[PDB]
Write a protein that binds this ligand. Sequence first.
Ligand code: MG
Ligand code: MG
Ligand code: MG
Ligand code: MG
Ligand code: MG
Ligand code: MG
Ligand code: MG
Ligand code: MG
Ligand code: MG
Ligand code: MG
Ligand code: MG
Ligand code: MG
Ligand code: MG
Ligand code: MG
Length: 131
Amino acid sequence: MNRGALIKLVESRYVRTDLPEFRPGDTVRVSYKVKEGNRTRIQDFEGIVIRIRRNGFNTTFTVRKVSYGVGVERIFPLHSPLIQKIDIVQRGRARRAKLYFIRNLSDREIRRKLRADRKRIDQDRAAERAA
RNA sequence: GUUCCCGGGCCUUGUACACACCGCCCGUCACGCCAUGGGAGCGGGCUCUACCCGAAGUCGCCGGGAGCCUACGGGCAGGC
Ligand SMILES: [Mg+2]
Ligand SMILES: [Mg+2]
Ligand SMILES: [Mg+2]
Ligand SMILES: [Mg+2]
Ligand SMILES: [Mg+2]
Ligand SMILES: [Mg+2]
Ligand SMILES: [Mg+2]
Ligand SMILES: [Mg+2]
Ligand SMILES: [Mg+2]
Ligand SMILES: [Mg+2]
Ligand SMILES: [Mg+2]
Ligand SMILES: [Mg+2]
Ligand SMILES: [Mg+2]
Ligand SMILES: [Mg+2]
């Protein structure tokens, strides 16, 4: 038997292919489905992805932003049906795969440390030219 | 005999006494009221210095791996 195969099979019905690829350092807007009273709505979360744990279907990514003076980090499973869409708002360039270190930097230092990844920007504009 | 004790007469001298020496008056200790100083400290106001971070905005640089406008030796966006 192939135990790994069986797993991926069970998993397969929930796998998404529709979301955009993104790298740690990028700034992103995640439109998340949320429930309150009594309705469900779409609530946006916009920050830098500071980490990407990979485990196939169980890959999860972590996003950090400052909201009204306090730092907030959000963790999302990448194939969560509760995510409507993810919009890349900016490509950034880390030299490092996990970016825990920006937790201790000023807004100025971060801007210096994570410069726009101009390469993937042209690259994003190279597409976005449909036929 | 008039030194002494009581009372009085005259001159004089001292006085913070004049309710007039059966006058006045000082400080502690006890009690009560009020205010003030000190006092381990507690709380508040204002202020000074050094550094970290830093909105809007002006000003300066850039405006390219790069957008929009051309009025293209430019401008705006945008970045520092
Ligand atoms: Mg496995
Ligand atoms: Mg099989
Ligand atoms: Mg006599
Ligand atoms: Mg006589
Ligand atoms: Mg006399
Ligand atoms: Mg006497
Ligand atoms: Mg006192
Ligand atoms: Mg005092
Ligand atoms: Mg004090
Ligand atoms: Mg004080
Ligand atoms: Mg310091
Ligand atoms: Mg400064
Ligand atoms: Mg130009
Ligand atoms: Mg400008």
